[PDB]
Amino acid sequence: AAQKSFRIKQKMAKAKKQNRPLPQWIRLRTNNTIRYNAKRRNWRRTKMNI
Amino acid sequence: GRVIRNQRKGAGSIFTSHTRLRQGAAKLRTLDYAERHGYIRGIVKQIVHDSGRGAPLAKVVFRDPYKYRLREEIFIANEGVHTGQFIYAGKKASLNVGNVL
Amino acid sequence: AMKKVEDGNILVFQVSMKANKYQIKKAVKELYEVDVLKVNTLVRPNGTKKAYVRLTADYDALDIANRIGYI
Amino acid sequence: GKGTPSFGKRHNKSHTLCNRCGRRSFHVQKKTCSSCGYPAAKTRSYNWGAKAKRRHTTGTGRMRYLKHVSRRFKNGFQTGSASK
Amino acid sequence: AGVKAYELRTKSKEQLASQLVDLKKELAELKVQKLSRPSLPKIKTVRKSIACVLTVINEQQREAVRQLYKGKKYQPKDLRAKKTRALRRALTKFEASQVTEKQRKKQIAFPQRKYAIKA
RNA sequence: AUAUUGGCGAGAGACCGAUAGCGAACAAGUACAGUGAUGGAAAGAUGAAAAGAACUUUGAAAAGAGAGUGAAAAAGUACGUGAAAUUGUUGAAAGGGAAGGGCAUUUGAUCAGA
RNA sequence: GUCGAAUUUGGGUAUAGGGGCGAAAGACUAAUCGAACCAUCUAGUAGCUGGUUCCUGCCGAAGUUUCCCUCAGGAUAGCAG
RNA sequence: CGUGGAGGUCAGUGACGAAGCCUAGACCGUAAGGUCGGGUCGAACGGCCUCUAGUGCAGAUCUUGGUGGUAGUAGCAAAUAUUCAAAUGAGAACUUUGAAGACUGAAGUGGGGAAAGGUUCCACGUCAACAGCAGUUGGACGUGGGUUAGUCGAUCCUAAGAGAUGGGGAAGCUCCGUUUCAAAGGCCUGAUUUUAUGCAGGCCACCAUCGAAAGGGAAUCCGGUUAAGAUUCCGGAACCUGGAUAUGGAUUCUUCACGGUAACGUAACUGAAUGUGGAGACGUCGGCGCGAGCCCUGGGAGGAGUUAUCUUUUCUUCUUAAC
RNA sequence: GCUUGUGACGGCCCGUGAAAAUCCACAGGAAGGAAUAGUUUUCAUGCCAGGUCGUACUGAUAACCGCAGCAGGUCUCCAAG
RNA sequence: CUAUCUAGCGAAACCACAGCCAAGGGAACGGGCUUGGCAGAAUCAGCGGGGAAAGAAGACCCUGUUGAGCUUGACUCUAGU
RNA sequence: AAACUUUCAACAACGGAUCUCUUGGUUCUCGCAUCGAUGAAGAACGCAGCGAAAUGCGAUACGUAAUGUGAAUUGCAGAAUUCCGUGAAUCAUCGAAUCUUUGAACGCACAUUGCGCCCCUUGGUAUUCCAGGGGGCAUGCCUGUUUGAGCGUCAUUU
Ligand SMILES: [K+]
Ligand SMILES: [K+]
Ligand SMILES: [Mg+2]
Ligand SMILES: [Mg+2]
Ligand SMILES: [Mg+2]
Ligand SMILES: [Mg+2]
Ligand SMILES: [Mg+2]
Ligand SMILES: [Mg+2]
Ligand SMILES: [Mg+2]
Ligand SMILES: [Mg+2]
Ligand SMILES: [Mg+2]
Ligand SMILES: [Mg+2]
Ligand SMILES: [Mg+2]
Ligand SMILES: [Mg+2]
Ligand SMILES: [Mg+2]
Ligand SMILES: [Mg+2]
Ligand SMILES: [Mg+2]
Ligand SMILES: [Mg+2]
Ligand SMILES: [Mg+2]
Ligand SMILES: [Mg+2]
Ligand SMILES: [Mg+2]
Ligand SMILES: [Mg+2]
Ligand SMILES: [Mg+2]
Ligand SMILES: [Mg+2]
Ligand SMILES: [Mg+2]
Ligand SMILES: [Mg+2]
Ligand SMILES: [Mg+2]
Ligand SMILES: [Mg+2]
Ligand SMILES: [Mg+2]
Ligand SMILES: [Mg+2]
Ligand SMILES: [Mg+2]
Ligand SMILES: [Mg+2]
Ligand SMILES: [Mg+2]
Ligand SMILES: [Mg+2]
Ligand SMILES: [Mg+2]
Ligand SMILES: [Mg+2]
Ligand SMILES: [Mg+2]
Ligand SMILES: [Mg+2]
Ligand SMILES: [Mg+2]
Ligand SMILES: [Mg+2]
Ligand SMILES: [Mg+2]
Ligand SMILES: [Mg+2]
Ligand SMILES: [Mg+2]
Ligand SMILES: [Mg+2]
Ligand SMILES: [Mg+2]
Ligand SMILES: [Mg+2]
Ligand SMILES: [Mg+2]
Ligand SMILES: [Mg+2]
Ligand SMILES: [Mg+2]
Ligand SMILES: [Mg+2]
Ligand SMILES: [Mg+2]
Ligand SMILES: [Mg+2]
Ligand SMILES: [Mg+2]
Ligand SMILES: [Mg+2]
Ligand SMILES: [Mg+2]
Ligand SMILES: [Mg+2]
Ligand SMILES: [Mg+2]
Ligand SMILES: [Mg+2]
Ligand SMILES: [Mg+2]
Ligand SMILES: [Mg+2]
Ligand SMILES: [Zn+2]
């Protein structure tokens, strides 16, 4: 809203920092059942709902 | 099988009085020693409209007999009462319009 | 931030999110032996705090940055 | 109206984040969380809501203190040191 | 390879405080270097050395306070034994071993005897 | 002595074998939906070992053709096997407003037994 | 149609389900209203509809009697194994 | 007859290939089915005597998943409209630039904001997916950068209202009630200065708190600056609050000022408790007056356009913040 | 002339159209005040500090809601000839 | 502007199997059955006769010892008073 | 006759059935009793050289201390191989600590990272203002301590 509470901005910052693809050195680990970031979020697809 | 309107009025959700613009409860002075035994003189400072009330209210200022200060009271203005008029309230006040006896 | 250091005599620091302007000024003064003209602070979109610390005219922020290891 | 045109008027949050549970169930006007019951001292839960109880019960978090109580009991709540 | 707690325990609190200050300065310079140098892992060793020094300092302070509170009742709560809450509320061994005079007399006069059958 | 679909630690089964078994064998009460109470999935398997295809060639590239690794590429991470529906190519056959079927034999193809 | 006052409207606030709210249409109460939504009781009951998974062999019906708040059902006798 | 599992047995079968699957190939049984050959495949499985059951599907507008014909079909037709060349690129109707033609026509398709969103902002790289054509482009993908305040808001106040406490109700979760049937209090200071404190001189409360980013409210403007920040940064120039303060000024020998008839003036020009008053602080409409900004317009000082002909001409700059 | 601010008025009401924080003033005279000297931070100048959170961008025929890059819905400021 | 044709993109409804008639009989109105008429690949744009076309376990009527909204000196109760 | 349609086979597709696997589930039995104001369960936000999650942890942040074992960790980078050693490890064990903001949640509030009060200390002349650091200020109830109120009331002086 451009006038946001600090709590909202903090959740926004956490979402920004976790809005990234899977690190590429993962998928090289020994067992590594993880293929991709299954929790990726985009503003155009799924809303944070605060 | 539905609660009727006069039943719903008792809950006082949307049926309360709109008291925002009201001047305050219109009451006589507290019945004290001065009114019980003699009289007390106040002054009509304002005759003002009260929202939701047909009758105008009179703001009458008295002196506090026990502390140095003024006590404003909200009377219901009687016809002929004017600003600057001295109102006398008590057992010994005269039989004049606006007096409290 | 480096352009600010070179031109505006302003050192740019990441600071503790609990620290206020008094604490930032005191910490810069103690750690770097410089008097601080003015501290401006913002919370970045990544949840860390950035401080623009403009030193007094007696100190060169470029020299201070070179002394503390980043140029 | 009442469908697509009326859905456009939805821009006022009935609920915000709850300080206790963080679920965005804190009713702004009632000042009460619809999920955990904050600010009531007890945490909201119902026996008809078995799935909700299982979602919020002990063990769903990290048990910062409770997870070591079993080991401390197994060691008898000793107080000294291993003493090489 | 970092600091060792058994080496730190031989030092005074002034030496430990000064070592902590030097370690904080070193960590600050290392995180300044990290901005340019990629993948610098010495900061982990410096962080663990800071943690060890703080641990030893806290150990010495708490041992000094324990000595200050030795023997007297009402030790500080964080220096008291942390059993469970119910265990700390339970009767001490002296209590619940207390018996009335009548019960003591009768349990002395008639204790459970040892007896075997022989047929 | 009795109870115990919770907690902790164990031992087992004529139980289920990934649409089963708890909803969840997997970053599952996760992703996601709802204002909210709540609702709530799908998703296991290369190979012994990545040995995960050096190198050449065509293409802008993705890829292809080789080469090669491997017991196997009819195992190429779109990975054990790999059904059916449905589809392509090749081969065979038939076909005047359905097709399919029963009895019988002609013809073509194919084949067992002696 | 109406368009300067029973006007339009934002935000805040209050009223919550047999309750609210209604210049009254049983209207509105989050695409839900002649009783919202959510979970549980609950796998609610159903004389009613649909379905009910291998082969062969042998035998092989009834829609009729009486009774029932019975007439789309059952009990009973009969037919059958 | 067949299936999952169990006890016994065939010292059964099997990496020299178990199970599974495919096979208009063969054999047996009336049949449920059984057996064999070939291909594929890779790790277990079967006959018989018994035991056991979550044991046999064509249907249930059955459940889950997958797949068709329809079918390259319906269609991708509102919002006036696009065109030429060059560049880039493998590829250009759609990207970029230039030129042209148009539209929104200031109640905008302009410039900002509130709610909401949360990085969509900006740069670089970049096109597997998305942008129902395309794509070299993007609100996409990948990596980074970016949001600077004493003066703008929140914060503070109270509004409708929400809501502890004291009390009362309720088995109870909790309900009422908001100053109420309460012993609800600290800030001024003589004295205490055995310590500016408790005692003890002496003054005041019909009351928590929450509730507005549009109500009330202490105070900031101009110019410049970024790829992306600006009343926040930089430069200059101010203001408010809180505090501390030393000069000057003022006042006093008539101690707490003088002048004016007066309305009142000033650079000041002591002022506790207590009380009083004002501001905060307020509807709507109508006409009239005035101010600002805009509009229109004259002269002149510059720049640009038209000039076959006419036009001392058409357009444009000539500005001045808070304090 | 348009927009806007404002002033003095007028019309209207059985409608007469918030509250509080806060600031100032006045009444009063408690108290403290001068002469080899006192008073005055409502006069001028001078010194110091002013924390915390938000600040990007869109605000819609693509950045919000409507399952979406949906002809829908969504409050407001400025406004040339 | 579509429809049409082309490049690109590309669904859905529906579908026992499918699709030429006449009469007959038949669950008394057949695309199939019987008897006749007939009958030649693969198709395009239209069209609204038919598919008792599709959309929905008919909302009308009846049955159920299935409900619900509402009313009343139905039966039995009940808050309040 | 082609095309087209249909049937079958081979190969190739689509799809993920079947088979075989199974660090999972389900049921039965046995043993034990251990959350929290010394701040629980739960939540928010952060922490790694390179991590979005799971798991772990809390500014001492995939962790510190202690003990045991005895040479690793591993995807890369880095470090080390003295590793015949108080010594690797994403080891095990775990008795000492840390334990952000919260949460019964406790100064008051909380749609605010809002607003106080007290003590000690530091800086700005500084008891008063501003700021930094450390420690505190909830309610009900119990025992005790101190200070009080009430002609409720006793004695004494009177
Ligand atoms: K009804
Ligand atoms: K088991
Ligand atoms: Mg700021
Ligand atoms: Mg509705
Ligand atoms: Mg609301
Ligand atoms: Mg499952
Ligand atoms: Mg598989
Ligand atoms: Mg093989
Ligand atoms: Mg596949
Ligand atoms: Mg395969
Ligand atoms: Mg097939
Ligand atoms: Mg034909
Ligand atoms: Mg009607
Ligand atoms: Mg059933
Ligand atoms: Mg027979
Ligand atoms: Mg009867
Ligand atoms: Mg029937
Ligand atoms: Mg079974
Ligand atoms: Mg085989
Ligand atoms: Mg076949
Ligand atoms: Mg194998
Ligand atoms: Mg079954
Ligand atoms: Mg089937
Ligand atoms: Mg059947
Ligand atoms: Mg079906
Ligand atoms: Mg289906
Ligand atoms: Mg078409
Ligand atoms: Mg159309
Ligand atoms: Mg158009
Ligand atoms: Mg175009
Ligand atoms: Mg162009
Ligand atoms: Mg037009
Ligand atoms: Mg136009
Ligand atoms: Mg952009
Ligand atoms: Mg496209
Ligand atoms: Mg494309
Ligand atoms: Mg991006
Ligand atoms: Mg302001
Ligand atoms: Mg209450
Ligand atoms: Mg407030
Ligand atoms: Mg305001
Ligand atoms: Mg900007
Ligand atoms: Mg400035
Ligand atoms: Mg003078
Ligand atoms: Mg206007
Ligand atoms: Mg902005
Ligand atoms: Mg903007
Ligand atoms: Mg706009
Ligand atoms: Mg949207
Ligand atoms: Mg016919
Ligand atoms: Mg007929
Ligand atoms: Mg038919
Ligand atoms: Mg015929
Ligand atoms: Mg038609
Ligand atoms: Mg028709
Ligand atoms: Mg029906
Ligand atoms: Mg029906
Ligand atoms: Mg009946
Ligand atoms: Mg009924
Ligand atoms: Mg803690
Ligand atoms: Zn909550």
PDB file of N, CA, C and O (backbone and C1' of nucleotides) and ligand atoms in Angstrom, chain J residues 57-61, ligand 56:
ATOM      1  P     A J  57     -28.723 -34.867 -13.734  1.00  0.00           P
ATOM      2  O5'   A J  57     -30.076 -35.699 -13.627  1.00  0.00           O
ATOM      3  C5'   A J  57     -30.926 -35.586 -12.490  1.00  0.00           C
ATOM      4  C4'   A J  57     -32.144 -36.464 -12.630  1.00  0.00           C
ATOM      5  C3'   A J  57     -33.228 -36.281 -11.568  1.00  0.00           C
ATOM      6  O3'   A J  57     -34.496 -36.527 -12.180  1.00  0.00           O
ATOM      7  C1'   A J  57     -32.497 -38.509 -11.549  1.00  0.00           C
ATOM      8  P     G J  58     -35.857 -35.996 -11.514  1.00  0.00           P
ATOM      9  O5'   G J  58     -36.867 -35.862 -12.740  1.00  0.00           O
ATOM     10  C5'   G J  58     -36.705 -34.841 -13.718  1.00  0.00           C
ATOM     11  C4'   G J  58     -37.696 -33.720 -13.524  1.00  0.00           C
ATOM     12  C3'   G J  58     -38.549 -33.809 -12.255  1.00  0.00           C
ATOM     13  O3'   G J  58     -38.654 -32.529 -11.637  1.00  0.00           O
ATOM     14  C1'   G J  58     -39.937 -33.547 -14.151  1.00  0.00           C
ATOM     15  P     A J  59     -38.550 -32.410 -10.039  1.00  0.00           P
ATOM     16  O5'   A J  59     -38.829 -30.871  -9.749  1.00  0.00           O
ATOM     17  C5'   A J  59     -39.366 -30.448  -8.500  1.00  0.00           C
ATOM     18  C4'   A J  59     -40.342 -29.313  -8.676  1.00  0.00           C
ATOM     19  C3'   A J  59     -41.673 -29.694  -9.317  1.00  0.00           C
ATOM     20  O3'   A J  59     -42.703 -28.861  -8.791  1.00  0.00           O
ATOM     21  C1'   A J  59     -40.565 -28.119 -10.686  1.00  0.00           C
ATOM     22  P     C J  60     -44.025 -29.520  -8.165  1.00  0.00           P
ATOM     23  O5'   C J  60     -45.018 -29.626  -9.404  1.00  0.00           O
ATOM     24  C5'   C J  60     -45.638 -28.471  -9.949  1.00  0.00           C
ATOM     25  C4'   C J  60     -46.734 -28.854 -10.907  1.00  0.00           C
ATOM     26  C3'   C J  60     -47.621 -30.001 -10.451  1.00  0.00           C
ATOM     27  O3'   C J  60     -48.673 -29.568  -9.607  1.00  0.00           O
ATOM     28  C1'   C J  60     -46.908 -30.377 -12.686  1.00  0.00           C
ATOM     29  P     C J  61     -49.030 -30.374  -8.267  1.00  0.00           P
ATOM     30  O5'   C J  61     -49.552 -31.783  -8.792  1.00  0.00           O
ATOM     31  C5'   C J  61     -50.775 -31.888  -9.502  1.00  0.00           C
ATOM     32  C4'   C J  61     -51.043 -33.310  -9.923  1.00  0.00           C
ATOM     33  C3'   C J  61     -50.828 -34.367  -8.853  1.00  0.00           C
ATOM     34  O3'   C J  61     -51.923 -34.487  -7.963  1.00  0.00           O
ATOM     35  C1'   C J  61     -49.767 -35.049 -10.846  1.00  0.00           C
TER      36        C J  61
HETATM   37 MG    MG L  56     -37.636 -38.567 -11.124  1.00  0.00          MG
END
